[PDB]
């Protein structure tokens, strides 16, 4: 019932983030349902590049988005205790919905 949502862009940096928070919870609480992912999220935007003319130069960029949900099974007073002010992933948005 306790949810740990993690919100970022790339799967190449969140992949060490789902490893650090299931194993450090295992040493203290050992009560988790496993990481259940979310569909990858795409924000594509075509933009004009020529400074004053020519509505043909549209280059596609995208700010990509990814979400992964940990969902520990039991409200443990040891998992949250050891992993309160602790998150390896840098430049990340953690959502510890208790």
């Amino acid at each position: 019932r306790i949810r740990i949502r993690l919100k970022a862009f790339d799967h190449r940096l969140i992949d060490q983030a789902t490893a650090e928070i299931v194993e450090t919870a295992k040493r203290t609480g050992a009560q988790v349902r496993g990481p259940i992912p979310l569909p990858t999220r795409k924000e594509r935007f075509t933009v004009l590049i020529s400074p004053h003319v020519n509505k043909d130069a549209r280059d596609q960029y995208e700010i990509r988005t990814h979400l992964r949900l940990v969902d520990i099974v039991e409200p443990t007073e040891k998992t949250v205790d050891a992993l309160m002010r602790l998150d390896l992933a840098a430049g990340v948005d953690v959502q510890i919905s208790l």
Binding site: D56, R58, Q60
Partner: protein, 127 residues
């Protein structure tokens, strides 16, 4: 008996499952004559099965969603060719010989910039 198949024709996802003995053609709780018994290509739900005998011997409870009408009508023959696995010794050889296991990726052609419907060029004369 209780064995699996898979068809994914044009963004349409299927869940195929084979049954022997009884004969009925049910397509996701829908009957044979009501849902598709007047729609065109009611044979494409049974297409490869002329050489075998199934109408009296095999019943199929088929569930396909998504995509389109013909895509759900195409996945049902694409899914059954991954679901002819019980007599696959007498089925896998012909279904490549009749090319029936193939996916036929006539995909969505993505919109290139400028190319109107991704291949269509705007009208440009000599001036």
């Amino acid at each position: 008996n209780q064995y699996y198949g898979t068809g994914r024709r044009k963004s349409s996802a299927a869940r195929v499952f084979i049954k022997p003995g009884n004969g009925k053609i049910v397509i996701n709780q829908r009957s044979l004559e009501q849902y598709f018994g007047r729609e065109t290509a009611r044979m494409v739900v049974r297409q490869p099965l002329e050489l075998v005998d199934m109408v009296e011997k095999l019943d199929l409870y088929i569930t396909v969603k998504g995509g389109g009408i013909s895509g759900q009508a195409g996945a049902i023959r694409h899914g059954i060719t991954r679901a002819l696995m019980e007599y696959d010794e007498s089925l896998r050889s012909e279904l490549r010989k009749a090319g029936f296991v193939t996916r036929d990726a006539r995909q969505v052609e993505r919109k290139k910039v400028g190319l109107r419907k991704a291949r269509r060029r705007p009208q440009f004369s000599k001036r």
